[PDB]
Write a protein that binds this DNA or RNA. Structure first.
Ligand SMILES: [Mg+2]
Ligand SMILES: [Mg+2]
Ligand SMILES: [Mg+2]
Ligand SMILES: [Mg+2]
Ligand SMILES: [Mg+2]
Ligand SMILES: [Mg+2]
Ligand SMILES: [Mg+2]
Ligand SMILES: [Mg+2]
Ligand SMILES: [Mg+2]
Ligand SMILES: [Mg+2]
Ligand SMILES: [Mg+2]
Ligand SMILES: [Mg+2]
Ligand SMILES: [Mg+2]
Ligand SMILES: [Mg+2]
Ligand SMILES: [Mg+2]
Ligand SMILES: [Mg+2]
Ligand SMILES: [Mg+2]
Ligand SMILES: [Mg+2]
Ligand SMILES: [Mg+2]
Ligand SMILES: [Mg+2]
Ligand SMILES: [Mg+2]
Ligand SMILES: [Mg+2]
Ligand SMILES: [Mg+2]
Ligand SMILES: [Mg+2]
Ligand SMILES: [Mg+2]
Ligand SMILES: [Mg+2]
Ligand SMILES: [Mg+2]
Ligand SMILES: [Mg+2]
Ligand SMILES: [Mg+2]
Ligand SMILES: [Mg+2]
Ligand SMILES: [Mg+2]
Ligand SMILES: [Mg+2]
Ligand SMILES: [Mg+2]
Ligand SMILES: [Mg+2]
Ligand SMILES: [Mg+2]
Ligand SMILES: [Mg+2]
Ligand SMILES: [Mg+2]
Ligand SMILES: [Mg+2]
Ligand SMILES: [Mg+2]
Ligand SMILES: [Mg+2]
Ligand SMILES: [Mg+2]
Ligand SMILES: [Mg+2]
Ligand SMILES: [Mg+2]
Lengths: 179, 41, 206, 14, 87, 26, 97, 46, 149, 122
RNA sequence: CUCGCACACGCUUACAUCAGUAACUAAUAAUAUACUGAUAAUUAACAACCAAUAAACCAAAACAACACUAAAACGUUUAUUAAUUACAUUGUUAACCCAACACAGGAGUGCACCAAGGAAAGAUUAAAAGAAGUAAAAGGAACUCGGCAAACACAAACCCCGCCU
RNA sequence: ACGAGCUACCCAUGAGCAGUUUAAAAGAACCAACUCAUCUAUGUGGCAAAAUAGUGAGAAGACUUGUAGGUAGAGGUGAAAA
RNA sequence: ACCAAAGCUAGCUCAACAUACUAAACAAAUACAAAAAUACACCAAAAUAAAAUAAAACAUUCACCUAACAUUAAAGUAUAGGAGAUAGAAAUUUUUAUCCUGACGCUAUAGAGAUAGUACCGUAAGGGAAAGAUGAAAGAAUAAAAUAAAAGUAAAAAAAAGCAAA
């Protein structure tokens, strides 16, 4: 069962090994859950093999046979992922109605940034937790100054990006006055 | 409105033409050359 | 693979991720920006494969097929028309194979030719009654087709043979889906007959 | 007093 | 290399010791009794998909321990790499 | 860069002078 | 002192472009216009500078009074320092007393 | 006697004195972090 | 599986199951001599011993006797044109040992076709013949040999 | 002057500094000081029989793609609950109180794999 | 000619193999542990991680017999509960660190004094002055601020000031 | 604001002191490692922003030394040399 | 003849408007020694700004000086002040929409520090760089094209005597 890391021995020394197109999302929306579950392993074994061949190509200072496969396979797996995820995220929207699979809150940290804080699983409730209790979600008053600076800095950047674009238009209009 | 001197080249030549036949660095370097030319006049 | 180009970059007809390119413009090159007439992607009337007439250069009044477009610099390539000669094979004792090569053209020097009378024309995008978007000639008042062209893979779908690891059209288009409310985990675990009793104790989230 | 001036290096990139 | 066994190099005092110092009038071995440590139980090995190893572990143990013991005995009698061994 | 025609033109004259000094025209 | 070797592209300014042709058109708006709008109204510029003038100190002082609370921190700080400097300089320094 | 070897490395000392946690435990430190964030420093802290 | 949350375990919880595994693996040829018992993989940083053993046995049906791992540090020393450091990524190496007495050997993946090598030697001989054809005549002395007379 | 930029890793510190590379803990420290593995925390790969089935890692080139419709909560509601609901409202047997026959789940804490706090990795 | 092997701390791939070095690193070359590229690599038994709460214990370490004064680091057992279930995780290269340098300097511990490590001279010539050394007739402090330095000497005495380490 | 990773003094916790002489581990004696830095010569953009060669002082103690902690500038610390 | 020299772009500056004002990106990990899934707690806080400087010293005093109320006047007036330096109101007055946004601003020692808060330097707070130029095409490098003009040198050592020239 160790040979699934290698292509059929009929392929070994050959430059071009041809191959099919990667799976579209659409073709995958048609398959059941079980068949996706299987296809995931068929794709896994092949991705493994391909990576093996990759490294072994680097080792021998030789170009890899038909490198493109590795791309295709990845997309397929990736695509497959996107599908299964859909069917969960649709589903939970039905059952619970939360758009996010992980519990989380909008918080304001020490630095005054407005952060999305993901939650974490603990065996004990939050007020009994030493480590969590010593985080601070809130800002002190001094921070307010820095916040302002942030805004202003941001504003500047946007401000002179805008002015740049404007300028680029004028230049072109006198270079290409086809109007 | 920034204004820089564009023609500085010629400004220098009007000194340096009188200095051509001097010996040493006086015949090249504007600083030395200027003083030498004035002394010559 | 996506190679990220530096903000200021020149386009030399060489594929941006290639040795010709890395050799032409190494890691730290920033050259003078070449002013490019901005064209929305919806105003762009030139594709690859269509017969076009050249309005400029030493070869003018001629017609040719467009091989490749470079959109970033607004360029077309008419194979074996706009031309300058270059040696390819080289070693110390041997200069081999002088090859005619193509210099790209701006889109101002090339006009699209309508099939019927083989004249150059001014193409304008029009919407017809079928919900279709086609190029219509200003001078001749006809619609011009679009140049169906081969693809980068050199693989034509009509002539094809399935290898070992290829899935057949039949099994790929087959719909196995029964859109029911269980997840992948519940589905699979039920199908493999894996039986689980215990449930998770309460977890606190924060 | 004891007057000493520590030597100052130039930037390495040079 | 021995390294792939795995085996590891270290350095500290090298000792040849019989179970007693040289000054002891009892210089020779009779038999040794080695109790196998917990990691090496037949059950554990059977869980790790090691069948044959059950035997191997024993062998190795003997081949090490006994050798050492004998070796040390020999070197208490003054024998060594260039004196080899008479009996 | 320095912005102006003047010095550039005036220098074009110098260029021409040197050109005539190194190769005199028949 | 090296001078540029290539003639620049000769820049052609047409003086008949719209902005140049229409220049100074409504300047007499007060007189001919039965005075309603003063020519000040024509002035496009910074809010504190429209139809007003003054030496750099006065200018700065005025900018701060009008827009000083809409300013960015760095710029307000800079302005205050500029004002203090100019104050000290104009009032306590010079030849003429 | 001879000088200039004043820095004798320890990772423990380093991370206790200048580390992230140390900067965040006092309001002054937090202001240090804030300043560096403002100036856009690549490394806010050790 | 990696990059994913795992459910907190408390006493008397359900067995944790991964239905579609995230990991991936390279089978690599050893840099040093190894006993025939031993296969060597490069795995993702987050995969444990137990993980890889289960992985091999379940997906590939390989009888694993023992597994060891180490983490290889990739060099940070090489510099950019900007003099920024480039980091070759760190990775995990896994030595496994096969159970039933099964001997492995890393297969040669690039055996050369003798007809393509003979065609390469014949094209090199033809190229050397063309470069010997184009080479100037000693006795002409540099007069271009195009002109009949 | 040490190293600020390079990331902090177990390779860097003293002996006392051990920081994992991000694999997940499989157990706890027991009585003897020896480590104990909990069979439940070790991920159990669920692998189907691949042998008897026909699908491949790649697809035939002449096989068509399709119009791309992302699955929405709505389409899924229409393929599953809509036929049953319409069938039992047309029959007058529809009960707005208990929807559980259609596949709706009031609360997640009973079942093995919960959707909202998300009990399962993959 | 002799600062050697290891560990801690610290450094982070500078280590390994193959190839290259016109130029870049070496304060020159030859070539390569240090420049360039490609490819690899340190595998746990050593080390880190590795229980609480009650309760009896006045009685030093010093070869510990027994003591000294300055009164001394280091755990047994009993009870009560401690998830019990192969394989967890992490450190394992180096000629290395702190001194801007491939710096005669600074660097803890264990064992060694060689069995391990190394090379004072690129090639000449054999001027002055300079540095470091060995020897010197007769004399023996006549030198000099002072027997400073040097010596085939390596001893005795007396004051001033501070008791002493 | 930042600094006690150098140095001053502390706090925890470790580590070293061989031979000889003595009833003695006596802030005794001789003399290594170790710690200092007497006197001279080198060196003076030096090997070195305080070193090298010799020569010296202490060497079971008010001794040396590792690791981790503390005290902060209107301050600290100090067998006072500002 | 070497060393060199020339580009005009990258972007910037100052205002206008404007909605409204902590950008982008978040799968996991991030306040253990940040980026290390998982165990019974603690958690948190405020006190007038000062001085350099002006008064020719300095002692009371010394505009602005991180607190929204603008504009035209009243007015540098009333007042306040070692009655010195200086400081300084108010009552009361005036203010007509929206579009016509740009430039007698910079062009690589300039304009932002910025190709970047990066390299590098500091234990740390912190400091903080330099650097670009072919052409329609280099998928036109036996490569083609217009400056050969700074100091420095080479082509080409020197020949009594002296501010080097006149
Ligand atoms: Mg320093
Ligand atoms: Mg390990
Ligand atoms: Mg640093
Ligand atoms: Mg460590
Ligand atoms: Mg270490
Ligand atoms: Mg274990
Ligand atoms: Mg270093
Ligand atoms: Mg190497
Ligand atoms: Mg060299
Ligand atoms: Mg080692
Ligand atoms: Mg020599
Ligand atoms: Mg001599
Ligand atoms: Mg001598
Ligand atoms: Mg002598
Ligand atoms: Mg004599
Ligand atoms: Mg005398
Ligand atoms: Mg005398
Ligand atoms: Mg003496
Ligand atoms: Mg004497
Ligand atoms: Mg004597
Ligand atoms: Mg005394
Ligand atoms: Mg300390
Ligand atoms: Mg002793
Ligand atoms: Mg003593
Ligand atoms: Mg000495
Ligand atoms: Mg001597
Ligand atoms: Mg000595
Ligand atoms: Mg002594
Ligand atoms: Mg003594
Ligand atoms: Mg401390
Ligand atoms: Mg004072
Ligand atoms: Mg004090
Ligand atoms: Mg005193
Ligand atoms: Mg004063
Ligand atoms: Mg004055
Ligand atoms: Mg004064
Ligand atoms: Mg004040
Ligand atoms: Mg009064
Ligand atoms: Mg007065
Ligand atoms: Mg600049
Ligand atoms: Mg700058
Ligand atoms: Mg010259
Ligand atoms: Mg004369």
């Amino acid at each position: 069962g160790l040979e699934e890391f290698f292509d059929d021995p009929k392929n070994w020394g050959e430059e071009k090994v041809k191959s099919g197109a990667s799976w579209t999302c659409q073709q995958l929306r048609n398959k059941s859950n079980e068949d996706l579950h299987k296809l995931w392993y068929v794709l896994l074994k092949e991705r493994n093999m391909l990576l093996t061949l990759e490294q072994e190509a680097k080792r021998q200072r030789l170009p890899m046979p038909s490198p493109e496969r590795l791309e295709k396979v990845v997309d397929s797996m990736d695509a497959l992922d996107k599908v299964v995820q859909e069917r969960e995220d649709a589903l939970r929207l039905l059952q619970t109605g939360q758009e996010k699979a992980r519990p989380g809150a909008w918080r304001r940290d020490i630095f005054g940034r407005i952060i999305w804080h993901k939650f974490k699983q603990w065996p004990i409730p939050w007020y009994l937790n030493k480590k969590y209790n010593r985080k601070r979600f809130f800002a002190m008053p001094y921070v307010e100054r820095f916040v302002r600076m942030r805004i202003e800095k941001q504003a500047r950047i946007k401000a002179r990006k805008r002015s740049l674009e404007r300028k680029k238009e004028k230049f072109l209009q006198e270079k290409f006055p086809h109007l | 409105l920034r204004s820089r001197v564009t023609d500085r080249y010629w400004r220098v030549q009007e000194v340096l033409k009188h200095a051509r036949h001097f010996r040493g660095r006086k015949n090249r370097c504007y600083r030395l050359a200027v003083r030498a030319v004035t002394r010559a006049f | 693979s996506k190679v990220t180009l530096p903000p200021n970059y020149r386009y030399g007809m060489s594929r941006p991720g290639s040795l010709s390119d890395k050799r032409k413009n190494p890691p730290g090159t920033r050259r003078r920006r070449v002013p490019v007439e901005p064209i929305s992607d919806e105003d762009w009337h030139l594709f690859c494969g269509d017969k076009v007439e050249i309005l400029e250069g030493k070869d003018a009044g001629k017609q040719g097929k467009v091989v490749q477009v470079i959109r970033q610099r607004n360029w077309v390539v008419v194979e074996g028309l706009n031309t300058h000669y270059r040696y390819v094979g080289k070693t110390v004792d041997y200069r081999g194979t002088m090859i005619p090569s193509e210099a790209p053209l701006l889109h101002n020097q090339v006009k699209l030719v309508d099939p019927t009378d083989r004249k150059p024309t001014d193409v304008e995008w029009r919407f017809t009654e079928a919900g279709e978007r086609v190029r219509v000639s200003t001078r001749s008042g006809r619609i011009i087709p679009k140049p169906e062209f081969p693809r980068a893979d050199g693989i034509v779908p009509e002539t094809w043979i399935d290898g070992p690891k290829d899935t057949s059209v039949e099994d790929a288009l087959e719909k196995t889906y029964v859109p029911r409310l269980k997840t992948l985990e519940e589905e699979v675990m039920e199908a493999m007959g894996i039986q689980e009793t215990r449930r998770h104790k309460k977890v606190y989230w924060y | 007093k004891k007057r000493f001036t520590p030597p100052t290096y130039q930037p390495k990139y040079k | 290399k021995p390294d792939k066994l795995p085996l590891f190099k270290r350095q500290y005092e090298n000792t040849i010791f019989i179970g007693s110092k040289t000054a002891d009038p009892l210089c020779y071995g009779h038999t040794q009794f080695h109790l196998l440590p917990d990691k090496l139980k037949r059950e554990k090995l059977l869980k790790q998909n090691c069948a044959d190893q059950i035997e191997v572990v024993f062998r190795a143990n003997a081949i090490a321990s006994l050798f050492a013991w004998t070796g040390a005995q020999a070197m208490y009698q003054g024998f060594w790499s260039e004196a080899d061994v008479t009996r | 860069a320095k912005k102006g025609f003047r010095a550039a033109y005036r220098f074009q004259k110098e260029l021409e002078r040197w050109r005539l000094l190194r190769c005199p025209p028949p | 002192f090296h001078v540029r070797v290539t003639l620049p592209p000769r820049k052609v300014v047409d003086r008949w472009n719209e902005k140049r042709a229409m220049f100074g058109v409504y300047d007499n708006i007060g007189i001919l216009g039965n005075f309603e709008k003063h020519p000040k109204e024509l002035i496009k510029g910074p809010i504190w500078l429209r139809g007003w003038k003054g030496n750099e100190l006065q200018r700065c002082i005025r900018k701060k009074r009008m827009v000083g609370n809409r300013m960015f921190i760095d710029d307000l700080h800079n302005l205050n320092k500029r004002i203090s400097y100019l104050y000290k300089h104009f009032n306590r320094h010079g030849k003429y007393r | 006697k001879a000088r200039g070897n004043e820095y004798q490395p320890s990772n423990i000392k380093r991370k206790h004195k200048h580390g992230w946690v140390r900067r965040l435990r006092t309001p002054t430190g937090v202001q240090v972090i804030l300043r560096r964030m403002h100036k856009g420093r690549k490394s806010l802290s050790h | 599986a990696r990059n994913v949350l795992y459910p907190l375990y408390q006493l008397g919880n359900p067995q944790l199951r991964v239905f579609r595994t995230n990991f991936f693996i390279q089978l690599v040829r050893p840099g040093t001599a190894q006993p025939e018992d031993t296969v060597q993989f490069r795995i993702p940083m987050e995969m444990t011993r137990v993980d890889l053993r289960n992985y091999l046995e379940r997906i590939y049906n390989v009888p694993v006797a023992a597994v060891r791992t180490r983490v290889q540090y990739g060099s940070n020393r090489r510099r950019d044109h900007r003099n920024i450091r480039i980091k070759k990524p760190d990775y995990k190496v896994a030595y496994v040992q096969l159970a039933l007495g099964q001997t492995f050997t890393f297969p040669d993946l690039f055996p050369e076709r003798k007809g393509a090598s003979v065609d390469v030697d014949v094209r090199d001989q033809v190229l050397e013949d063309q470069r010997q054809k184009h080479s100037p005549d000693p006795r002409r002395g540099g007069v271009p040999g195009w002109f009949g007379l | 002057g040490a190293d600020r930029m390079s990331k902090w890793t177990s390779k860097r510190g003293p002996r006392t500094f051990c920081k994992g590379r991000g694999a997940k803990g499989t157990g706890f420290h027991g009585r003897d000081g020896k480590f104990v593995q909990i069979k439940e925390m070790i991920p159990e790969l669920v692998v189907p029989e691949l042998a008897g089935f026909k699908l491949k890692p790649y697809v035939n080139y002449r096989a068509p793609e399709g119009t791309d419709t992302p699955l929405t909560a709505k389409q899924l509601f229409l393929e599953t609950a809509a036929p049953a609901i319409e069938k039992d409202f047309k029959a007058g047997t529809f009960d707005p109180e208990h929807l559980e026959k259609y596949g709706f789940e009031p609360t997640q804490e009973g079942k093995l794999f919960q959707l909202y706090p998300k009990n399962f990795p993959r």
